Amino acid sequence: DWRATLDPARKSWIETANDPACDFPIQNLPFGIFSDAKGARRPGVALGDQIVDLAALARAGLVTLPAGADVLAAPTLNAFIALGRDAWRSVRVQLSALFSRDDATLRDDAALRAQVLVAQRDATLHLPVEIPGYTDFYSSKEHATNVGSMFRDPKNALLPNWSEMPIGYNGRASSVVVSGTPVRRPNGQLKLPDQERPVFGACRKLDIELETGFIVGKGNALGEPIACEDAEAHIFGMVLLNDWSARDIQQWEYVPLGPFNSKGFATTISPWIVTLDALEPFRVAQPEQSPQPLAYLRHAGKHAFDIALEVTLRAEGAAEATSICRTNFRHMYWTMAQQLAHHTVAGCNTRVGDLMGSGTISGPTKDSFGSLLELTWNGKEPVALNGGGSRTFIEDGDELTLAGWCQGDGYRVGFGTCAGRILPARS
Amino acid sequence: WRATLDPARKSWIETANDPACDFPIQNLPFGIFSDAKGARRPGVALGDQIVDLAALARAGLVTLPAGADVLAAPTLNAFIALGRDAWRSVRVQLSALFSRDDATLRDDAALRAQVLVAQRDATLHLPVEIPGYTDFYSSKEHATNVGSMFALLPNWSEMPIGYNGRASSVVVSGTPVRRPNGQLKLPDQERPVFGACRKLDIELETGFIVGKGNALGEPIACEDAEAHIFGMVLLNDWSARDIQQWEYVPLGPFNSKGFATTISPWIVTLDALEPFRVAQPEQSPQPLAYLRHAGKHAFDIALEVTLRAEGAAEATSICRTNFRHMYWTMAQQLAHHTVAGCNTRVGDLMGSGTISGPTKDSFGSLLELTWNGKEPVALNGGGSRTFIEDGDELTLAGWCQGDGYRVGFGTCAGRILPARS
Ligand code: NA
Ligand code: NA
Incomplete structure (x- = not known):
């Protein structure tokens, strides 16, 4: 399932991701912790020059995790990580699908994009x-x-x-x-x-x-x-x-x-x-x-x-x-x-x-x-x-x-x- | 707090006053223990017993700085973070309460059964x-x-x-x-x-x-x-x-x-x-x-x-x-x-x-x-x-x-x- 997310042909409607020089294409999707003026430090994923606010995305129903304690309210990623590899992949797969150029769900919802994405330029890591x-x-x-x-001498x-x-x-x-x-x-x-x-x-x-x-x-x-x-x-x-x-x-x-x-x-x-x-x-x-x-x-x-x-x-x-x-x-x-x-x-x-x-x-x-x-x-x-x-x-x-x-x-x-x-x- | 180091001081918990006991009233070390009564929480050793700090606090017999409840915690870290004045304050209140002549807790049998736990029945x-x-x-x-x-x-x-x-x-x-x-x-x-x-x-x-x-x-x-x-x-x-x-x-x-x-x-x-x-x-x-x-x-x-x-x-x-x-x-x-x-x-x-x-x-x-x-x-x-x-x-x-x-x-x-x- 998740091996499809490694496809080099895949691209995002976040255009900065598709720059060949960008560290954060859709193929990457690293996890981190960030804060901004909107809120206290919390989990995020880099894409292009933006950050995906995972908590905000979850509140909007656009990413789902195992039922349980809320790991995206946490100031660190430990709780999320603890959920295990199936969860890591599940989240990766949902994100890759959602931010793929042709998925209109979040891309064409301007109001919601302004609530779930944060420019790296305005965030503190x-x-x-x-x-x-x-x-x-x-x-x-x-x-x-x-x-x-x-x-020691070369031999030693x-x-x-x-x-x-x-x-x-x-x-x-x-x-x-x-x-x-x-x-x-x-x-x-x-x-x-x-x-x-x-x-x-x-x-x-x-x-x-x-x-x-x-x-x-x-x-x-x-x-x-x-x-x-x-x-x-x-x-x-x-x-x-x-x-x-x-x-x-x-x-x-x-x-x-x-x-x-x-x-x-x-x-x-x-x-x-x-x-x-x-x-x-x-x-x-x-x-x-x-x-x-x-x-x-x-x-x-x-x-x-x-x-x-x-x-x-x-x-x-x-x-x-x-x-x-x-x-x-x-x-x-x-x-x-x-x-x-x-x-x-x-x-x-x-x-x-x-x-x-x-x-x-x-x-x-x-x-x-x-x-x-x-x-x-x-x-x-x-x-x-x-x-x-x-x-x-x-x-x-x-x-x-x-x-x-x-x-x-x-x-x-x-x-x-x-x-x-x-x-x-x-x- | 230096009064709590007095070698003459003794407890109504009689096992504390055995010369060989590690846990006289002069000591009062801190730890974390659980029993069948509850999940792991802060305690203090005295004689062959343990003082349940949370339970003592609920009964009003020990008080800490106003704030978050450090005695609900499964470790002592939060309590320790409160600083030396707190460590001493708690030590002073305990030494006074468990001194042989303080009747407050000693003569309240019902409450003693709620706030003291035998080391024998506890897990550390x-x-x-x-x-x-x-x-x-x-x-x-x-x-x-x-x-x-x-x-x-x-x-x-x-x-x-x-x-x-x-x-x-x-x-x-x-x-x-x-x-x-x-x-x-x-x-x-x-x-x-x-x-x-x-x-x-x-x-x-x-x-x-x-x-x-x-x-x-x-x-x-x-x-x-x-x-x-x-x-x-x-x-x-x-x-x-x-x-x-x-x-x-x-x-x-x-x-x-x-x-x-x-x-x-x-x-x-x-x-x-x-x-x-x-x-x-x-x-x-x-x-x-x-x-x-x-x-x-x-x-x-x-x-x-x-x-x-x-x-x-x-x-x-x-x-x-x-x-x-x-x-x-x-x-x-x-x-x-x-x-x-x-x-x-x-x-x-x-x-x-x-x-x-x-x-x-x-x-x-x-x-x-x-x-x-x-x-x-x-x-x-x-x-x-x-x-x-x-x-x-x-x-x-x-x-x-x-x-x-x-x-x-x-x-x-x-x-x-x-x-x-
Ligand atoms: Na170093
Ligand atoms: Na060792």
């Missing part, structure tokens, strides 16, 4: 879900090899265990924020090479980390693992994820318990959840794994996704941003399924809304590394900026943007943006 | 919704023991080292804990195998519950930190050591600790611990300024771990230690957590790290007690252990010893279920 937990993986071979090269860069399992840690949920939120430069302990003791001060190596994160759509009970083959059914959708990192703070704190303050000060995600169903046409073969992993981590078929990714940096007051990274999601060595299976193999429970980060996404070439640490090799080769100037690490006032999208024939399924501007550190 | 649940769980590493002796197997890195003494724990898998005392499966690296094989954990372990800790959060980007000054803390609980950070060794470099422990973490159900308020405040250990070298604090910020909490094999008549005491020996304090941990801007929220759980004293009978895990399975522990009643075996029940207990009474934490227990096969 919020965190799409309440995140119960945030886990962050480490699944780009190229990233892991780059970073380990700064601690990738530790054996990295290739046996999708290495990961628990992130800090509380400090995950939505695109657009200004991010204050952190203070903390800095170890200088020529002083016995650390000093306290403003981070001098503030950095981005290009990642994607998936949102869990069905949890699992404590003590009951999710089989690698069932994993994707548990995933609702994806977002872009900037795991802001303070590299000088990190180096000094991270042994042996991992990064902590250096990453917990802020993590930014894009507002619109792109459903996995919408990514179906961009499913591709994941990289070959060698050595062949243990049985519990194996899966048949295609479990990677073809998502072009880009990072830009704009200095305060610059007329144009600088593209600093171009890469793709498809090169990740461990898949979402494998990460989710590994997360639960010991019995740990996942919950609706959980956020799971891919780890910094880095390709093989020098222009495809997903952090400035990598791009500038720890501040040794600075990046030239479009419009003059240069950078090693991020400077106060800079705006960092993540973008991502899947290229179809004459359309794209896009993620929107994942942005943030850096505020000066507290004194 | 997680006292709060935990938005985040962080776990520290602040016992010098523990960190030195562990580092000596794979000692103290310089940074350990410059800051309270910590990591993000897994909130979702924190469970209340009494919950059975299933032995985890995962990747095990054997010494004689190039490649890991998958199987049942062979070195399942406890970690004796305490955790504190955050009572007032802080906004993202606004640190909590070390000196203000304790005002942000509501109370404490016992915390068993169950650990699979064989899974851990293989996974933990470089991003830290993950699956090895996330399968289960158990906390005791009763939150002992920081106010109730006031009489047991003591001088923390000397720190050398002197930490950076942001981490310093004046005064006494350690607490004198005797701690014990027992292990009972399935069907054994008696448990074996395997660890006796005390909270006061922790090198970093709760205040310093909370300051360090927030120094870079990270926000905390009401209900956040913060673990101390494994608590180990200097002597061989005061180490807070079996990894330490048995030196990684080389010196097994003899059990009371026969038998022996290296790591935990299916059916074993592990219990954490803790208490502060006053003159003729104690403020106690209850227990933090769990029985191990076999691994899924």
